[PDB]
Amino acid sequence: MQILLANPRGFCAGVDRAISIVENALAIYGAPIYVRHEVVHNRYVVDSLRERGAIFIEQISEVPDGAILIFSAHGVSQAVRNEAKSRDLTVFDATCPLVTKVHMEVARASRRGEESILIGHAGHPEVEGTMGQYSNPEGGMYLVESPDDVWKLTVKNEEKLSFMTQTTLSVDDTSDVIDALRKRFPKIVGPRKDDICYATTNRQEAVRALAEQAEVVLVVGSKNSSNSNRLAELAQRMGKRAFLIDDAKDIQEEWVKEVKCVGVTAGASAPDILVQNVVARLQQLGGGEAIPLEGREENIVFEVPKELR
Ligand SMILES: CC(=O)CCCOP(=O)(O)OP(=O)(O)O
Ligand code: F3S
């Protein structure tokens, strides 16, 4: 059985920064360090950090006065940041710079009292945080997930309307939502294409190339990671069996019995050691040396804040 590796796969710049922010806070201040939400949606990263003294919370009312709190890579609403800001908390912000870019646009629209539409998945922490930058009652902030959501939306003033997106969506499905937005609201203003980040776009391009060669695709990533779910979905729509797995123990022998070419990729939040262990298991199941596909080069790094060097 041949094993192919997607390229790029695995950690993006935002995830490497966010994990380093927690690790470095632990090293400088000691345990406990509180983190608002899983720093990234990866069960191995979050358990690793817990075992070193990070405490993951959903609400600020879970954090003691005077504590160090880090916001996760997904970002937080103004209400959350003010709830921390009003309390005693030393805050470090691990929000990805590519989410912060979107938040600055929503904040600009709110200050103008002009309505904004976000494309994104309801209940996702990044959507909470981005919707949560809009505060002006004179405008409005609306969420859409699909063309049908666009077809039913009504707004106060469609001559003064803009759109933003979540960073970890399907490039293809998002393109269809944007086409519906522009047909419904021909004066709508937005980015050239979407706010989907380089890492999401590149891993989807890479898994497409992988799925063109591989009969089965394994995506290393956790169930609650949107970008990792998009990679599995994309291979499945190409007609390949694709499985989202947290680690090598999840691999069922039937999925690769008789398969001549298995492909492996990993979401932006999944560490490379997980992929190495998956490759080791596929080898026990008859695979050979893993062959990385040629891929688009990535060269972006985001540094930790100077406070945490
Ligand atoms: C800022 C982000 O939304 C991406 C963070 C890294 O990936 P992950 O934590 O898996 O988040 P998603 O659920 O958005 O893919
Ligand atoms: S928004 Fe940032 S955290 Fe990663 S998946 Fe994209 S570079």
Which residues is 71 bridged to in the sheet?
Answer: 36, 93
Q: Which residues are annotated as a binding site for dimethylallyl diphosphate?
A: 41, 74, 124, 225-227, 269
C-alpha closest to that of 272 among 25, 36, 37, 44: 44
In this structure, what DSSP letter does residue 65 have? T
Q: What is the CATH number of domain 1-11+197-298?
A: 3.40.1010.20
Q: 215, 1 in Cβ contact below 8 A? A: no
Domain range list for the chain: 1-11+197-298, 12-96+299-309, 97-196
Could you tell me what percentage of the chain is helix, strand and coil, using 3-state DSSP and rounding each to the nearest 5? Answer: 45, 15, 40
- Tell me the CA end-to-end span of the chain in Å, nearest whole number: 45
Distance 158 CA to ligand 2 centre (A): 31
Residue of 126, 212, 215, 303 marked active site: 126
C-alpha closest to that of 150 among 128, 180, 127, 175: 180
C-alpha closest to that of 15 among 59, 74, 80, 58: 74
For tokens 């990993």, the residue is 266
What approach was used to elucidate this structure? X-ray
Q: How far apart are CA 49 and CA 234, in angstroms?
A: 31
Residues with CB under 6 A from ligand 2: 12-15, 73, 96, 98-99, 167-168, 197, 199-200, 227, 268
C-alpha closest to that of 277 among 264, 268, 267: 264
Q: Which residues are annotated as a binding site?
A: 12, 41, 74, 96, 124, 167, 197, 225-227, 269
For 12-96+299-309, the fitting CATH number among 3.40.50.11270, 3.30.1360.30, 3.30.420.40, 3.40.50.970 is 3.40.50.11270
| Same fold yes or no, 12-96+299-309 and 97-196 | no
Q: How far apart are CA 245 and CA 285, in angstroms?
A: 16
Q: What is the CATH number of domain 97-196?
A: 3.40.1010.20
Residues with CB under 6 A from ligand 1: 14-15, 40-41, 73-74, 96, 99, 126, 167-168, 225-228, 267-269
Q: Secondary structure of 127-140 in the HEC alphabet? A: HHHHHCCCCCCCCC
> DSSP labels for 136-176?
-TTS-EEEE-SHHHHHH---S-TTSEEEEE-TTS-HHHHHH
Residues 6+ apart with CB under 8 A from 169: 119, 120, 121, 194, 196, 200, 226, 230
Q: How far apart are CA 170 and CA 53, in angstroms?
A: 35
